[PDB]
RNA sequence: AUUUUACCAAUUAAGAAGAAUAUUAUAAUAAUGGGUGUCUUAUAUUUUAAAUAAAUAUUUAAAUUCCGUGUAGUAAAUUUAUUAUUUGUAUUAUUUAUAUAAUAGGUGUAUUAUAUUUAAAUUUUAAAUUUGUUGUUUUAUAUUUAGAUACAUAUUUAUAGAUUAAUAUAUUUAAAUAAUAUUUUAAAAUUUAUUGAAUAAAUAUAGUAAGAUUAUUUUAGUUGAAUUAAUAAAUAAAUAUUUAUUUUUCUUUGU
């Protein structure tokens, strides 16, 4: 039985400890803000 | 109530009630809810941690109180948050009767957990004593199955 | 209590009077329409 | 999203239309298919002392009411269960069959009370140590 | 009034209020001062693994040895970015850097003196700046993290040449 | 439905790619099975209606 | 020597994932106020009281009473329980788009009555209100789409009088025990609160003003009557639904 719903994104270490769950959450949020793999955007509202 | 109070305060203080982005963001940020913590009403008339040295004899030699085991035993414990439990002579426990009720009550507005008393299951599985909505004991399914199978019925 | 929309696409579809804005300003002159250019992005950059 | 949801509507009283006024004034008589509602004849009027000294004229006799008024009252009884034409109208006064059918339904086969005219029968002899705070 | 017609469900209030999430990503974005319960819960959980591990005593909590302050002091985390245009192929006396908003002039000069060894720092000109905002192809408004602009002044002009 | 044909509708709207996997294939129910034959169209040849490949 | 009169005609296949962890009920196992871009402390983060309420109740008698606004434990911890995102797209039902358009170069006439081609002959559109039934009043641009609730029925277990005001009396024939509902939009300001005349509740109710109320080709009666407030007098009449009396007669006649 699932301890968390299927739509919850897994943010945890490979062992199962949540010591840096907020650190990983902040890393994912920074990735969502500006992904390092972001290519050449096409929008007219470019960041620069 | 608190949301409307904060909204009126901000409207009277810093909101121009125009189409500006300041007010447009305030109208949505003021809906956020603040921290709620049940603060017990302090008693400046009677300090419970002050009566520790009351109703005690003292040794004339060292001029300090006598650690009476009978007093330590019969001492009544009054609860408080910064001073978790305080011993007090049982003669003065009457003035602290309201602190007892405020401590026994769940530190939460009754209308937040009122969904308990509004159904039969929780009305039977929960306790309602001095407005303390603490869940009673409940056997596990394995436990009740084992009990019934041992009772052979 | 009313909203002002200067020039918005009609019922049948966006016309040239709005595509001019879409190509120059970057979005429709109302601001209520979100700029969505995934199709041309796929057609050119990808 | 969410608004005031409507719930089930409670039905009216099964004997709501029959009126104590009718039950006091008129009474039903005759065979089932020729029932007539009859009330005592005479003229009711309050007059001063010294009038109608002779009592032999004042007669206690029953005369039937107008057929249109009888039809109206019978229709007031017929209001209940109108769609079933196979169901005869109710009666001005409840009968033994009605009092029995009030509990003869299978949903009342377990209740010891309300059975065989419990409300109609006089109460039982209470205990001698009976007392209330 | 016919109250028996309704069932026991609380109707939604009219007019309905907006979610407390601030949706404006412009120049005038406001920081919400109201503190939520989830914020305290998350802070406590990242501090000492609430509620599995027992809480450390008040002494260790308020001391300099508490894990967050200890890690911030022994493993500092400060993002200092140099603008390539300000010092690339031009002998400039005022190079500019980007820092987090929690730093100051003294913080930046100590940073450059201890980590990178840039001791000759005349004056640092501080100026905050809202994070860069932009829309992607589908039109979602994603704003970059905020950054503080600093304009450090040196005694000698510096330049990093770009071999063309 | 006992047998839901892939071109039929059941709690769903007509999506072309979901209801027609192959346009040249016609699905029928033969012996309580989904049989997928080739689609034919009727054309008038020599005074009779002959069946030709519909896609072609 | 240039040289084709005037007028008269038509909505149809639809190219594209530009249709779904989609709408609405349905889960009787959780629950301290949800707010992500969050993140120091709280003299500044406290809501409580024996009543009808997020707890909602298996009958028709009698009885207070100047329209009787009414029915009681079925089991004593017993199985009518306020349930919810996936160990079935949870299951079972129900509903669902308003973007994208080449279409014909002339059938009736040419001094003026309005589609059916032999030429004429015909008319001013409907639905409501006006009962002195109009010439009064009001509405309708068109296309597509929503729009309004009295059960046309009863197979063997099966068993159904009345009557006095009352105490009473009972020598007269039957029966398919089933209840739940009952147009719509409106004709009015008092109510219950909140914020500095607006805001949010009230299908609350108006002896109830007015209108709208979706389904051709059908198969049997009346076309201006009746009108007695109140002791023992054969009977009100129209309209409509079901339903019943084959008697004489020279023909006829809806009682
Ligand atoms: Mg009555
Ligand atoms: Mg009548
Ligand atoms: Mg013509
Ligand atoms: Mg389409
Ligand atoms: Mg529960
Ligand atoms: Mg229609
Ligand atoms: Mg007749």
TrEMBL record, chain A:
Protein name in UniProt: Chaperone protein DNAj, putative
From TrEMBL, chain C:
Protein's recorded name: Uncharacterized protein
Organism: Trypanosoma brucei brucei (strain 927/4 GUTat10.1)
First and last residues shown, out of full length: 30 to 75 of 449
UniProtKB/TrEMBL annotation, chain D:
Keywords: Metal-binding
Binding site for Mg(2+) 2: 68
Residues annotated as binding Mg(2+) 1: 18
Protein name as it appears in the record: Uncharacterized protein
Species of the source: Trypanosoma brucei gambiense (strain MHOM/CI/86/DAL972)
Lineage of the organism: Eukaryota, Discoba, Euglenozoa, Kinetoplastea, Metakinetoplastina
Automatic annotation (TrEMBL), chain E:
Keyword terms, alphabetized: Ribonucleoprotein, Ribosomal protein
GO MF annotations in UniProt: structural constituent of ribosome
GO term, biological process aspect, one: translation
Keyword Transferase annotated: no
GO cellular component, one term: mitochondrion
Protein family: Belongs to the universal ribosomal protein uL23 family.
Protein name: Large ribosomal subunit protein uL23m
Organism whose genome encodes this protein: Trypanosoma brucei brucei (strain 927/4 GUTat10.1)
Lineage: Eukaryota, Discoba, Euglenozoa, Kinetoplastea, Metakinetoplastina
Residue range from the parent sequence: 65 to 228 of 246
């Amino acid at each position: 039985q699932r301890k968390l719903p299927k739509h919850f994104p897994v943010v945890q270490a490979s062992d199962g400890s949540s010591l840096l769950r907020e650190e990983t959450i902040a890393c994912m949020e920074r990735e969502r803000r500006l992904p390092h793999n972001m290519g050449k955007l096409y929008s007219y509202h470019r960041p620069y | 109530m608190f949301r409307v109070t904060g909204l009126q305060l901000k409207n009277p203080v810093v909101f121009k009630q125009g189409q500006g982005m300041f007010s447009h963001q305030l109208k949505r940020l003021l809906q956020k809810k603040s921290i709620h913590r049940y603060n017990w009403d302090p008693l400046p008339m009677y300090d419970p941690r002050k009566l520790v040295h009351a109703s005690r004899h003292m040794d004339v030699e060292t001029w300090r109180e006598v650690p009476d085991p009978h007093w330590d035993e019969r001492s009544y414990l009054v609860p408080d948050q910064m001073f978790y439990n305080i011993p007090v002579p049982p003669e003065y426990k009457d003035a602290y009767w309201w602190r007892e009720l405020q401590a026994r009550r769940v530190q939460c507005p009754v209308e937040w957990v009122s969904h308990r008393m509004y159904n039969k299951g929780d009305r039977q599985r929960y306790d309602f004593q001095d407005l303390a909505f603490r869940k009673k004991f409940e056997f596990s399914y394995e436990e009740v199955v084992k009990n019934a199978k041992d009772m052979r019925s | 209590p009313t909203l002002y929309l200067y020039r918005f696409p009609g019922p049948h579809g966006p016309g040239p009077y709005t595509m001019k804005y879409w190509w120059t300003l970057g979005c429709f002159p109302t601001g209520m329409e979100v700029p969505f250019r995934l199709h041309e992005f796929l057609s050119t950059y990808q | 999203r969410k608004a005031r949801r409507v719930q089930l509507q409670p039905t009216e009283y099964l004997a709501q239309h029959r009126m104590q006024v009718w039950q006091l004034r008129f009474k039903e008589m005759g065979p089932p298919f020729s029932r007539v509602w009859v009330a005592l004849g005479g003229k009711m009027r309050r007059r001063r002392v010294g009038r109608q000294v002779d009592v032999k004229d004042m007669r206690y006799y029953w005369r039937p009411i107008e057929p249109q008024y009888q039809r109206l009252y019978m229709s007031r009884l017929r209001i209940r269960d109108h769609s079933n034409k196979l169901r005869q109208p109710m009666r001005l006064r409840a009968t033994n069959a009605d009092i029995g059918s009030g509990s003869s339904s299978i949903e009342w086969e377990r209740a010891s009370n309300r059975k065989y005219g419990a409300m109609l029968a006089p109460p039982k002899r209470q205990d001698f140590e009976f007392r209330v705070v | 009034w016919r109250t028996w017609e309704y069932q026991h469900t609380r109707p939604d209030p009219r007019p309905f209020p907006d979610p407390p999430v601030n949706d404006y990503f412009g120049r005038s974005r406001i920081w919400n001062p109201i503190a939520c319960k989830l914020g305290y819960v998350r802070k406590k959980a990242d501090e000492w693994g609430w509620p599995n591990k027992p809480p450390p005593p008040t002494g260790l909590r308020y001391s300099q040895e508490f894990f967050p302050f200890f890690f911030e002091r022994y493993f500092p985390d400060a993002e200092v970015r140099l603008l390539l245009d300000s010092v690339l192929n031009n002998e400039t006396k005022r190079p500019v850097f980007q820092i987090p908003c929690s730093m100051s002039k003294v913080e930046l000069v100590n940073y450059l003196k201890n980590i990178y060894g840039i001791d000759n720092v005349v004056r640092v000109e501080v100026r905050n700046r809202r994070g860069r905002r932009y829309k992607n192809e589908v039109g979602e408004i994603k704003m970059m993290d905020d950054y503080k602009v600093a304009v450090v002044e040196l005694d000698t002009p510096v330049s990093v040449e770009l071999k063309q | 439905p006992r047998i839901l044909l892939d071109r039929s509708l059941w709690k769903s709207l007509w999506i072309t790619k979901l209801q027609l996997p192959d346009i040249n294939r016609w699905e029928r129910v033969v012996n309580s099975r989904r049989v997928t034959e080739d689609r034919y169209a009727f054309v008038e040849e020599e005074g009779v209606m002959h069946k030709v490949n519909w896609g072609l």
